[PDB]
């Protein structure tokens, strides 16, 4: 699809057969999912964003289905304000900024 | 133009007599800038993301360009890790999302 930024770019994705909404954002290296549970193991790691520093666990090798379509990649869980798609899966999709 | 994703969106703004570099970011509603003492009236708010919130001063009608383009409109400024062209300007400029 082609997208326009008068509002939020909120899309729906399917991870692990549940339907959640997450913003497509090109400002974010990573993929950042509110508290969750998924399968596994992890490592715990640490992330900043604006507001400073938060503990995530890194789940490697997991499947998304953005917009139906597909990626398979680092996803990180966390305290996020709002599920996040990174960079490291908007490639993954093909996606890009263009004007 | 089309920019992939493959490293983080910097590019060129101009604010001013200030030329910096800033994210195209998808993911911010607004546009946050590092400190600079910009004229005129502004209006204190705090803003939140990964980390938590950061007090930022909101100045209005703020001429930019950003890679030639003009844009016109608020520009919020604190002590943000990272300038970032939200979502405001991002739609000023014509930038969609696209995949
Ligand atoms: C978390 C989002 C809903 C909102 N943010 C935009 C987001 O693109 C930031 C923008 C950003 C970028 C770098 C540093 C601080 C903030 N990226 C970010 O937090 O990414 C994190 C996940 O991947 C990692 O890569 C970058 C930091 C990590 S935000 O910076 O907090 C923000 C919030 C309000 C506005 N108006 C402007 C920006």
Same mark, same amino acid.
Request: aromatic share 6%; with cysteine; glycine share 14%.
């Given at each position: 699809? &082609?997208? %326009? #930024?008068?509002?939020?770019? #909120?899309?729906?994705?399917? +991870?692990?057969?549940?339907? !959640? =909404? $997450? @913003? #497509?954002?090109?400002? $974010?290296? /990573? %993929?950042? @999912? =509110? =508290? ?8 715990? !790691? ?8 938060? !503990?995530?666990?890194?789940? /490697? &090798?997991?499947?998304? =289905?953005?917009?139906?379509? !597909? $990626?398979?990649? %680092?996803? *990180?869980?966390?305290? %996020?304000?709002?599920?996040? +798609?990174?960079?490291?899966? *908007? ?5 890009? *900024?263009?004007?």
């Amino acid at each position: 699809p &082609q997208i %326009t #930024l008068w509002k939020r770019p #909120l899309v729906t994705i399917r +991870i692990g057969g549940q339907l !959640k =909404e $997450a @913003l #497509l954002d090109t400002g $974010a290296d /990573d %993929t950042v @999912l =509110e =508290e969750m549970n998924l399968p596994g193991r992890w490592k715990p !790691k640490m992330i900043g964003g604006i507001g400073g520093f938060i !503990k995530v666990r890194q789940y /490697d &090798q997991i499947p998304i =289905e953005i917009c139906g379509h !597909k $990626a398979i990649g %680092t996803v *990180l869980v966390g305290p %996020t304000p709002t599920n996040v +798609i990174g960079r490291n899966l *908007l490639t993954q999709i093909g996606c890009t *900024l263009n004007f």
